[PDB]
């Protein structure tokens with residue numbers, strides 16, 4: 002599979018040893034097929050549900066829960082039947098929870114979509130070849146196409162492989178290579194070789210790329226490469242080779258579990274030690290077996306107590322909402338987890354024209370040579386109005402409107418803009434707007450024509466659907482467009498050969514109209530036109546021409562300049578080979594300068610401002626365009642990337658410059674650069690690598706398969722709403738409106754979503770900290786179970802869930818975009834915050850245990866050993882006549898449990914309020930700042946009473962409380978929390994960080 006673009010048509014045929022008129026022989030096919038394999042991309046890897054669930058159960062916590070569920074399930078079968086009945090609820094609930102998550106991962110992933118899978122939508126099922134075993138073309142499955150056999154394609158055919166073109170049967174071959182780039186503008190292909198072996202696809206003018214479509218023509222080619230070796234094929238490899246890290250929250254979360262696990266086992270260790278006496282005092286007795294059940298059933302309590310079971314749901318319900326939210330702001334986010342990382346974007350690389358600008362061109366300045374005499378030179382600058390492609394505006398000289406016709410040089414400038422253009426205008430009725438037909442910079446040139454109808458032809462007496470191509474059409478009737486030498490990046494220009502209409506303008510007859518980048522065309526001009534006369538180009542006139550060119554493109558105008566010229570006596574037709582592009586530059590020489598035109602691709606209104614917020618936000622911004630660097634810089638200044646007088650030398654690079662650099666300085670340039678002029682194929686992927694070495698969260702934009710690898714490697718690939726489907730599938734976010742401003746807005750909701758997200762996480766996680774202390778003490782003391790897994794569970798999923806997801810709606814700080822982007826390594830809980838929940842938790846742990854124990858001691862509804870003998874409640878039915886003297890089952894009393902729980906519940910609806918703000922007291926940040934937070938608390942409270950007052954729930958979750966004494970007890974136990982926190986919160990004034 003050679004690199005055919007540089008080799009001749011004969012070279013490639015010889016290489017594979019194939020006959021153009023015969024094709025590969027059955028042997029050749031067999032051989033080639035074995036060596037290069039089948040012409041397709043490797044199959045997809047969508048591992049089964051079994052492999053899914055297995056992963057849905059690969060989390061260290063989900064495991065710990067599974068184990069716990071088992072122990073509970075095992076215990077749920079160990080005691081006499083009837084009275085126990087509910088002891089199948091504990092294991093059943095846990096499992097549901099787990100199972101439910103497993104049910105999520107399955108439906109979750111199953112509806113996803115690999116960007117690689119999308120590529121296969123580009124593989125045509127069939128192709129057409131010429132093989133030795135027949136004379137007429139064979140229509141075989143693309144899959145079986147091989148390097149070396151002759152392929153034939155025509156209009157509408159999807160190119161089956163990377164084909165070197167041998168001969169074009171039609172009069173012209175045009176191809177839509179958009180799926181690579183996105184530009185729908187078909188491209189003309191040729192047959193002669195392309196010298197440079199390191200040429201970028203865009204210049205492989207004799208090549209057909211697997212995946213592209215044939216816009217016009219029919220051609221014959223020899224397959225150069227196939228499968229994974231094809232251009233789109235190389236890309237698939239890059240995209241598969243690329244690995245993407247976990248969201249920093251997912252990182253921090255996994256870490257939490259990695260530690261949550263060690264502590265748990267550590268506790269077990271400690272507990273075992275606190276009750277190590279059972280080795281030197283327990284005389285072999287019967288009850289010495291009902292003790293293991295204690296440790297086991299307390300282990301499951303320890304487990305559901307340590308895990309934030311509801312957290313997963315709170316987070317996704319939060320992100321999903323934030324998602325639908327960002328959507329209204331035109332930011333389509335794919336993959337919820339991205340919302341976070343988006344909030345942390347350090348750098349944003351944005352393509353210019355589509356998103357930073359509008360891609361709505363319009364000529365603002367023209368200029369023709371007015372006078373050349375000696376060193377004395379005089380131009381004829383003009384100005385034009387009208388931003389739309391709408392034929393509405395006027396040409397002015399010194400702000401004074403003018404009749405274009407009164408100028409000769411202009412009538413020409415006009416003819417050229419009209420003839421050497423493959424675009425047109427069109428007026429639609431649906432939305433009564435004038436729409437661009439061809440390419441933006443051309444469709445503009447036509448607009449320039451209408452607005453300056455040189456001949457003064459009557460148009461106002463015409464409808465809109467004709468007013469569009471009125472003056473343009475007239476010019477097309479004074480000259481005949483024989484053929485056109487298309488544009489190519491070598492000569493950076495284009496011409497059209499023309500002959501007049503007999504006896505109407507046959508003065509000189511055949512003319513050649515060329516437009517293109519100034520530098521090239523001007524050098525190729527030996528004469529300048531001054532009206533109807535011509536004069537030899539001279540040093541001064543040239544200098545003047547250029548100077549105004551640099552002003553217009555370098556100055557504040559930031560305009561794209563097209564030099565315009567004609568070849569007065571073009572070569573004779575018979576002397577031109579119109580099918581091999583290299584000779585075009587030669588055919589476009591000895592030209593006569595007839596004037597340049599400047600156009601503008603206006604920055605988007607909101608851009609100027611958005612660029613600013615990023616500055617406030619400490620988010621660097623990098624422009625990636627196709628403009629010559631000079632103009633690149635100018636534009637960067639016009640929008641604020643750079644300061645009108647800021648030094649940029651070291652901050653702007655052209656793709657070529659960047660290449661001449663060694664990996665070293667190449668990385669430097671990246672941490673400092675803000676502008677990249679003419680970026681070649683791989684630059685986006687490299688720049689993203691460097692920005693990553695400096696640990697920067699970067700955002701790239703792009704829309705073709707060409708950019709998929711970069712969009713995949715970037716932390717947040719950003720696709721255009723109007724871009725390709727492969728780009729979209731490669732990106733985490735899609736800009737419905739293609740607007741840069743949408744990116745920034747998004748970054749913002751990001752930062753907001755996370756801030757709230759950060760608190761409800763802290764809220765839940767801390768509770769779990771305290772729940773555990775309860776379970777620890779309950780065991781360390783030997784005291785009867787203060788809280789049960791089932792209760793805990795309900796709490797962590799429901800009672801605490803609702804206020805958690807309500808905190809999700811906390812109002813946004815006001816300086817969110819004035820603070821630098823959050824460091825990914827920034828932990829959720831540390832230092833003094835660790836200390837606080839360190840305390841709060843400890844508090845709820847004592848408050849919860851004490852409360853339940855209280856009902857046992859000092860309570861007027863079932864008193865107990867105020868001497869702390871309850872500690873041996875295990876020993877009751879044994880030595881009943883010991884110190885008991887009462888019912889040996891009060892230890893299984895429901896009230897004492899509904900006590901410690903109602904005290905937790907409240908302590909949580911309380912701690913939930915302490916979480917509205919990390920450091921601001923409630924007298925500063927009152928609870929009514931989040932009506933939802935209050936509304937939810939009510940919903941949890943009534944829900945709490947639902948498990949007490951109902952009748953079936955009571956059996957599983959105990960019997961109710963007395964409201965005046967039992968409940969008030971609860972309050973004087975919980976309510977104090979708010980104080981404890983406000984106290985530790987106030988400690989923020991004794992420190993220096995606010």
Ligand SMILES: C/C=C(/C)C(=O)O[C@H]1C(C)=C2[C@H]([C@@H]1OC(=O)CCCCCCC)[C@@](C)(OC(C)=O)C[C@H](OC(=O)CCC)[C@@]1(O)[C@H]2OC(=O)[C@@]1(C)O
Nearest residue numbers: 256257260261264307769770773777828829830835838839
């Ligand atoms: C959740 C419940 C419990 C009981 C737990 O063990 O959490 C520890 C733990 C694993 C961490 C700690 C917990 O440490 C303790 O509570 C001290 C142990 C004493 C209790 C035993 C009684 C004898 C977190 C919870 O709490 C405080 C306030 O100290 C804060 C933070 O967690 C987060 O930022 C949450 C990340 C989602 C982590 O230090 C975290 O370790 C990390 O790597 C982090 C960065 O994750």
Ligand SMILES: Nc1ncnc2c1ncn2[C@@H]1O[C@H](COP(=O)(O)OP(=O)(O)CP(=O)(O)O)[C@@H](O)[C@H]1O
Nearest residue numbers: 442443488493494495516517518519562563627628
């Ligand atoms: N249709 C056309 N024919 C001839 N020259 C053209 C042209 N459109 C533009 N030019 C001139 O040729 C030079 C380059 O054209 P090229 O096609 O590489 O530009 P481009 O800026 O449109 C790339 P990008 O689409 O990435 O912005 C331009 O800078 C301009 O001066």
Ligand SMILES: [Mg+2]
Nearest residue numbers: 440442488627
């Ligand atoms: Mg162009």
Ligand code: NA
Nearest residue numbers: 712713715718
């Ligand atoms: Na990505």
